[PDB]
């Protein structure tokens, strides 16, 4: 009985296993751009 760490989430939806993978890849490979003026 020591408690635990967790993270909160909205009810926006549970992803698939593939989407979890996709998110990490897309962040990692994203090209940084500051604005679109």
């Amino acid at each position: 009985d020591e408690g635990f760490e967790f993270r909160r989430h909205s009810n926006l939806g549970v992803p698939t296993l593939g989407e979890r993978l996709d998110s990490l890849h897309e962040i990692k490979s994203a090209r940084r751009m500051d604005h679109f003026n």
Partner: protein, 104 residues
């Protein structure tokens, strides 16, 4: 006020549909569609917080037929064909860029 009522409003107001959403460990994600008769682009928006918020834009070409993507090739700048990261303050600028590109 329901989520369907808000989604209906913005579909007719600024031509954006939200199809699928999910939250994973990196952030909030939205399978999104934008445009009109002139041209439609599907894409993924992800909001990853680090507190500052970053937006990840992922283009989605699968729904596009061969003809509407050769039109897309002419209308879109190259960066809208690639996965982008940008701060949250530029999201509206992004929408306007995408609107003007599709409307060409």
């Amino acid at each position: 006020e329901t989520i369907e009522i808000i989604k209906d409003l913005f579909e007719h107001l600024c031509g954006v549909r939200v199809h699928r959403t999910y939250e994973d460990d990196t952030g909030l994600w939205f399978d999104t569609s934008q445009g009109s008769k002139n041209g439609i682009m599907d894409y993924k928006l992800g909001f990853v917080k680090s507190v500052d918020t970053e937006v990840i834009y992922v283009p989605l070409l699968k729904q596009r037929t061969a003809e509407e993507l050769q039109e897309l090739q002419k209308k879109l700048p190259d960066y809208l064909f690639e996965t982008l990261s940008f701060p949250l303050r530029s999201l509206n600028q992004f929408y306007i860029k995408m609107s003007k590109s599709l409307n060409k």
